[PDB]
Amino acid sequence: SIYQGGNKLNEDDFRSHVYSLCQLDNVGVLLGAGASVGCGGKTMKDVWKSFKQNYPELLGALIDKYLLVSQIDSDNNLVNVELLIDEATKFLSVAKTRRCEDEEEEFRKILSSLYKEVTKAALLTGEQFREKNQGKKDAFKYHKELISKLISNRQPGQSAPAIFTTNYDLALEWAAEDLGIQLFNGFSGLHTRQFYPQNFDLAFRNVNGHYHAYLYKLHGSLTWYQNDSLTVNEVSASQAYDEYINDIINKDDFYRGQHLIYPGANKYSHTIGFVYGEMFRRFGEFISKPQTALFINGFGFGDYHINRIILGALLNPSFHVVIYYPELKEAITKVSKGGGSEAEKAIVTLKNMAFNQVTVVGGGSKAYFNSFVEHLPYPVLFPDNIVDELVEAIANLSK
Amino acid sequence: SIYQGGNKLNEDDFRSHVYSLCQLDNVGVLLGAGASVGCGGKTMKDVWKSFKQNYPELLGALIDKYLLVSQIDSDNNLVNVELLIDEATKFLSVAKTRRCEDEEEEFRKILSSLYKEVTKAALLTGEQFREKNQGKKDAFKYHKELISKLISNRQPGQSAPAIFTTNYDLALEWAAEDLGIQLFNGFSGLHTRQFYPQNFDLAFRNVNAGHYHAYLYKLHGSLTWYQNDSLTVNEVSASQAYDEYINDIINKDDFYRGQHLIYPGANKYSHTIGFVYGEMFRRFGEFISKPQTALFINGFGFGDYHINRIILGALLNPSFHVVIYYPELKEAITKVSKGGGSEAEKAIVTLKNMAFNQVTVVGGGSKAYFNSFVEHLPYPVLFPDNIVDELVEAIANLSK
Amino acid sequence: SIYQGGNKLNEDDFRSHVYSLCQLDNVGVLLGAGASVGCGGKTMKDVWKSFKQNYPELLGALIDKYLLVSQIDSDNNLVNVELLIDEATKFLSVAKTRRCEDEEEEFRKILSSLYKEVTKAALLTGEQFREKNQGKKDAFKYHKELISKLISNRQPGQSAPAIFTTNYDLALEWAAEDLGIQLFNGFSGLHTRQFYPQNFDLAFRNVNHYHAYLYKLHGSLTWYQNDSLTVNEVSASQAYDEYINDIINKDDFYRGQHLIYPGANKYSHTIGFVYGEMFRRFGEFISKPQTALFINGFGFGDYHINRIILGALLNPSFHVVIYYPELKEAITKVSKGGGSEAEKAIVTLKNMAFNQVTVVGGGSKAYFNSFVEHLPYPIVDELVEAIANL
Ligand SMILES: Nc1ncnc2c1ncn2[C@@H]1O[C@H](COP(=O)(O)OP(=O)(O)OC[C@H]2O[C@H](O)[C@H](O)[C@@H]2O)[C@@H](O)[C@H]1O
Ligand SMILES: Nc1ncnc2c1ncn2[C@@H]1O[C@H](COP(=O)(O)OP(=O)(O)OC[C@H]2O[C@H](O)[C@H](O)[C@@H]2O)[C@@H](O)[C@H]1O
Ligand SMILES: Nc1ncnc2c1ncn2[C@@H]1O[C@H](COP(=O)(O)OP(=O)(O)OC[C@H]2O[C@H](O)[C@H](O)[C@@H]2O)[C@@H](O)[C@H]1O
């Protein structure tokens, strides 16, 4: 269930290790798309089912004329969405050069439908997306505990925690604004909010309140748009819903560059994108510094970039990592049978190393977001220890 | 029924935490109108009960014509005094603007008939208000104990304790004058006492090194303060105050003309002649924005907007600890579970559900009274070997 | 006329004195409603005249039945509307509580008309109010200079400049945003903004870039109190889509205790708390040592600001500079028997025998624009265009 360096580890020692791992100089987390399942989110598996059910006509064309997907994989619902986008874009680009009008519309329809399906699963509240004070609900009660535990475990003279994510939903912002705390994401201004890369080096100070954190979104957001003027703007949720989200969801018009996101395999296709590179540079720079700990939850290991970056970080004798993977036993069994997908071989390789700096936690339902939040400890405000634990010695001498 | 951070803890851990808190850089306390119940005071509910009995026709007119209070709200004892006073003042002002005649005098009578109950309930002793040695009785023992416990625990090179209150009575001055302690109030002189804001930074000093003193802040004025036409604040003794201007209030009727400085109102910013009220709150705000600070609250009912806001906004510091006493706690949770309850019943339950270790809430009914509050305070240890007795700790207890 | 406590000095002495004042520890700038006329602002006189000439049918009722407008002041255009709105709201609340059905609908018309007249003179851009980068226009040019130089004067290790304004229009925010400088106004968040008073003591510092404070005395067009008992804030576009557009382009509709401008709802603690906070912060700043305050665009028509300014003059290190143009006319009016209490208060400061007060009067001598270019002084476009060519 719990492995450290290829061996087996118990529970009490695991808790003691986790407690000691939160006292280092740098602590950070990385949250995937499975972390927001309890708040009302979806998963890429359900997107395929929704697309298949809602659009029964385009699937036939895709499987018949263009041979972009196999029949058995479609029936089993085990197809990769992040890969079909690249093939569809390549097909669209090839046809547009030779002036073939019939194929362009048929591929634009597929792209518009798939993008419409993707965006709808990030609202988390349906039509209630345009209301206010959504952070007071009971669903967003564990994010608040996570933030409180991450920030309360700090000593004066240390650095602030950092949070990395690969989602689009506005759960972290709502949870943080509920408690009245401020997060920094490189934006500033109210009426005209822009992106300034140098706003990541600013911290609070008392002239005569010391509670803040950073937040990096590695794949954009649902409220960021570009006007092609080499600038990026951010607006509120109700403003965005009134502007373009409602039209995209309901009017079923053709998709354009209303909002910038990165669904796909090759992230370098967007040449004029200068945000993605900046965020990944900050991630890589944060990793390299010594005396660092990192907790990973909700990640499916389906990205070449991230799991290629992680592997090279273990040559530093000051980097510790904790990885949660629910369905570990199935992957272990299936790799020995001949092999499986590329996502599972990576996690199997990590488990089998011989360094005492990698820990993998499995166990199905007990390696979820709630359990991960529960494992984090509370600080001890006031540290005799010479007789305090010796009082119970009299009690246990009463056999 | 003791909670911190949403969890629960026992008595021994609570007492150890209380002992730990008392030896910080700064220590303070905040009292309310519930702490004077044991000394002979009364709450606003008794004030309303007396008013409804003593003025039948005024209540009837209010119910029938002016419609300020509904028939169902009054009988079940759920009315409010601050909002009623504010609404009556607004109605009087609009009546004056409309140049009315009967409404003006009727609302003047209504307003003048209300301050009498407050002044009557603020005496704590009755006819013996203008007498000497009032602190020698047995009704002020616990206040003396609290003052002694607060003063004794301090170490050389630290800051003097501070006390805040929202009362009109003199339960603290009588107790402090019996022991010989010299409180600093913000006044000077004997034959003419004036409010100088610059005296809040003065400390005693002996040429050969009495050493015991403390500060007192009254947030809502006092019963012994009157403002002259020269925009000055003067303080007198109890005997002179009783003799000159407060005797006529009880015996006679309709003779209230800004005689004493009190704020029974929900909002005080509309009143634009009071600057001491803004003076005390600056010190209160400055006190709770310093590192290594602790604060105890007892007798407060969370009925003030400004205090609630300033307390809530002060929890963002990482070196602030607070203890709150609130006797009827289970009922508030039960009423909130249905989504209802008053705003006061919601402010307390919101605080209890925080995820920080820097907040503590105590309930239990009769276990969270003023008498029990003083008992939890620890006596200092003088000479401490304390390292060899811990060896004997196991030996001493050998029953079986 | 340019007099310094009753004496006269050349321009060089004035420049040296203002330079010495600008080299103090604490500085502050106070602006009134007269500062907005440089880009499309309006004064009380013009709006009152327009209301008189547009709705004369209900002015007689306001005088005969309610007794709200002084006839002599109305003819002389010497009436305050800010107090009138507050008393109208009080009257409406009293009528609603008393359950007077006939009288309840009467005050809706006057309140709607007053709010329609008020909001027409605060957009400053008309129908283009909901666009972006509106601070880039040439109209908001001297505001950039004022803010930039005020920030530039401050030396390292000292405090930050403060700005007090009575206008309730989005004027300084555009200039601050387009300049590239952050300002703190006691609000935080993006999706749901709330008012936290304790934000006026924060600062920035690079771990390996300054700011300024703004105090809106009477609120703004964006601050509004929703159904919940909390104070919020919205952007210009959202407010325009929500309520600003309707009240200007609708027949008759009134919500009630919803909006928090201009200094209107002071009878509610939830709404009066912010006003009290601004008053307290102003008073606290005024009563600090070695402070210099610059006044401009204020008509001295308030019974509260004048007295609190007068009381603070006890300290020998509190300098006040006033910019009131019509000084010689004031002297001529004072010469005869007739006079006004406001102008008597204004001319009282000229009876001082110490070199701290300096009153500037005349024509262009004391204007909000001219006041801007009195403080001392402290490409990319070509490259941007070259890049934009592709
Ligand atoms: N309740 C739960 N709590 C935690 N983890 C869970 C839970 N339920 C399932 N899981 C695990 O959550 C995981 C679900 O994996 P998926 O979200 O499809 O893969 P990814 O995270 O790489 O996709 C993120 C995409 O978002 C970007 O836009 C890019 O397109 C990324 O590819 C499995 O391990 C489940 O067992
Ligand atoms: N024996 C007791 N010992 C301690 N506390 C007690 C006791 N009995 C009751 N309490 C608590 O004492 C508290 C007071 O009951 P509340 O009805 O809020 O008092 P008020 O209405 O007279 O005015 C209270 C303040 O609110 C106003 O705005 C003014 O600022 C007043 O100062 C409750 O928690 C009681 O349970
Ligand atoms: N270009 C100009 N240059 C100089 N002064 C000017 C200019 N244009 C106008 N003025 C002067 O600007 C002045 C405008 O005076 P008022 O608008 O009454 O002052 P406030 O609103 O700031 O005062 C606030 C109070 O007003 C409310 O009623 C409440 O009582 C508020 O508390 C006149 O003297 C003009 O000559």
Q: Which residues contact C54 (CB under 8 A, 6 or more apart)?
A: C117
Going by their DSSP bridges, the two strands B7-8 and B2-4 should be labelled as: antiparallel
Method: cryo-EM
Of B87, B93, B267, the CB nearest to C272: B267
Residue A355: half-sphere exposure toward Cβ, Cα within 13 Å: 15
DSSP H or E stretch at residue A305: helix A304-312
Length of chain B: 400
Chain A contact for B393 (CB, 8 A cutoff): yes
Question: How many A from CA of B346 to the centre of ligand 1?
Answer: 38
Chain B contact for C285 (CB, 8 A cutoff): no
Q: Is the C-alpha dihedral spanning A172, A177, A180, A184 positive or negative?
A: positive
**How far, rounded to the nearest angstrom, does the alpha carbon of residue B16 sit from its chain's CA centroid?**
27
Interface test with B, best of A394, A396, A397 (most B CBs within 10 A): A394
Question: How many A from CA of C44 to the centre of ligand 3?
Answer: 7
Length of chain C: 390
- Contact between B345 and B332 (Cβ < 8 Å): yes
Residue B33: half-sphere exposure toward Cβ, Cα within 13 Å: 18
Contacts of A391 in chain B (CB under 8 A): 393
Cα B355 to Cα A141, A148, A375, C235, C246, distances in angstroms: 10, 7, 15, 33, 44
Rounded CA-CA distance C283/C308 in Å is 8
Length of chain A: 399
Coil, strand or helix at A184: strand
Between the two ends of chain A, the Cα-to-Cα distance in Å is 36
DSSP string, B111-177: HHHHHHHHHHHT-SSGGGGS-S-GGGSSTTHHHHHHHHHHHHT--TTSPPPEEEE--SS-HHHHHHH
Cα C121 to Cα C40, C116, C299, distances in angstroms: 8, 9, 18
Q: What is the resolution of this structure in A?
A: 3.2
Q: Which residues contact B279 (CB under 8 A, 6 or more apart)?
A: B197
DSSP H or E stretch at residue C225: strand C224-225
Nearest alpha carbon to residue C266 among C66, C33, C32, C85: C85
- Contact between B77 and C107 (Cβ < 8 Å): no
Of C177, C188, C238, the CB nearest to A182: C188
- Contact between A323 and A358 (Cβ < 8 Å): yes
Among left, alpha and beta (phi > 0; psi -120 to 50; other), residue A363 is: left
Query: Partners for C (CB, 8 Å, 3+ pairs)?
Result: A, B
Ligand 1 atom closest to the Cα of residue A44 is 18
Quick one: chain B helix, strand, coil %, rounded to 5? 45, 10, 40
Coil, strand or helix at A386: coil
- Contact between C325 and C331 (Cβ < 8 Å): no
DSSP string, C174-200: HHHHHHT-EEE-SEE-SSS-EE-GGGG
Of B357, B387, B394, the CB nearest to A379: B357
Chain B contact for C284 (CB, 8 A cutoff): yes
Cα A57 to Cα A46, A51, A321, distances in angstroms: 19, 11, 46
Tokens of A392: 């119970």
Tokens of A119: 């965006």
Contacts of C98 in chain B (CB under 8 A): 66-67
**How far, rounded to the nearest angstrom, does the alpha carbon of residue C354 sit from its chain's CA centroid?**
30
Q: Which residues contact C276 (CB under 8 A, 6 or more apart)?
A: B269
- Identify the nearest ligand to the CA of B306 by its number: 2
DSSP H or E stretch at residue A163: strand A162-165
- Contact between B271 and B229 (Cβ < 8 Å): no
∠ CA(B76), CA(B77), CA(B81), 5° rounding?
145
- Residue located nearest, by CA, to atom 36 of ligand 1: A326
Coil, strand or helix at C333: helix
Cα A162 to Cα A31, A32, A212, A398, C14, distances in angstroms: 12, 15, 10, 50, 54
Quick one: chain A helix, strand, coil %, rounded to 5? 45, 15, 40
Rounded CA-CA distance A301/C150 in Å is 53
Rounded CA-CA distance A358/A350 in Å is 8
Q: Is the C-alpha dihedral spanning A375, A376, A381, A382 positive or negative?
A: positive
Å between B292 CA and nearest CA of chain A: 12
Rounded CA-CA distance C359/B379 in Å is 64
Interface test with B, best of C94, C257, C265 (most B CBs within 10 A): C94
Quick one: chain C helix, strand, coil %, rounded to 5? 50, 15, 40
Coil, strand or helix at A80: coil
- Residue located nearest, by CA, to atom 33 of ligand 3: C299
If one counts every other C-beta atom within 10 angstroms of the C-beta of residue C157, the result is 5
Rounded CA-CA distance A341/A345 in Å is 7
